[PDB]
Amino acid sequence: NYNQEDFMGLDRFFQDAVSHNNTDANAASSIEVEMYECDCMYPTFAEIARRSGQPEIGAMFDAIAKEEGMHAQLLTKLYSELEVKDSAETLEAKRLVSTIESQIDAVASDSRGLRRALETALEVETIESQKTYPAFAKLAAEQGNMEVATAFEAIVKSETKHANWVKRALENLLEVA
């Protein structure tokens, strides 16, 4: 059962935090992904938006990026000593970032570049808000880590808001008049 892969592999920018038995390790994985989104993924989407002639959508992605760093920093405050390193999958994503950056004028000139960037943002925001962070919050609570559970609950709310922002932006982008 073969499906075509997305235009320029843009879907592979989405990175999911990894599930563990221990809430520290879920936190470490979250920090890693949220900082990748803050540092790498959303800034690249922002530049695709600007180069596409969509500076308002670019500003949205810059605003979201800052918030991803807030999520990371909330967790790092709770886990002051944790040493976060990029996994093989994050490193591969950062390589894809760099290859798209090198081709950024071609990606932006095609209407699909920004469309797929917004659809990929929607994909992560949906998975993180509806699946990954609820599961981390639930496990934190089960383990008696109330402060971390409450942090994950706040990140769930925030990622939900990002999903809504991204859907309204996508609805805009596509509607010409």
- Other CB atoms within 10 A of residue 21 CB: 8
Determine the length of the chain.
177
Interface stretch with Fe ion, choices 42-50, 68-76, 80-88, 95-103 (CB under 5 A): 68-76
* Stretch binding Fe ion (CB under 5 A), from 2-10, 15-23, 34-42, 82-90: 34-42
Measured distance CA(63)–CA(86) in Å, rounded: 23
Query: Does the annotation flag 125 for ligand binding?
Result: yes
The site map against Fe ion for 100-139 (x = CB under 5 A) is: -------------------------x--------------
Q: Which of 114, 162, 165, 166 binds Fe ion (CB under 5 A)?
A: 162
For 111-148, the three-class secondary structure string (H helix, E strand, C coil) is: HHHHHHHHHHHHHHHHHHHHHHHHHHHHHHHHCCCHHH
d(CA 173, CA 113): 12
Q: Is 68 in the site for Fe ion (CB under 5 A)?
A: yes
Q: Does 20 appear as a known binding residue?
A: no
Q: Which residues are annotated as a binding site for Fe(3+)?
A: 34, 37, 68, 125, 128, 159, 162
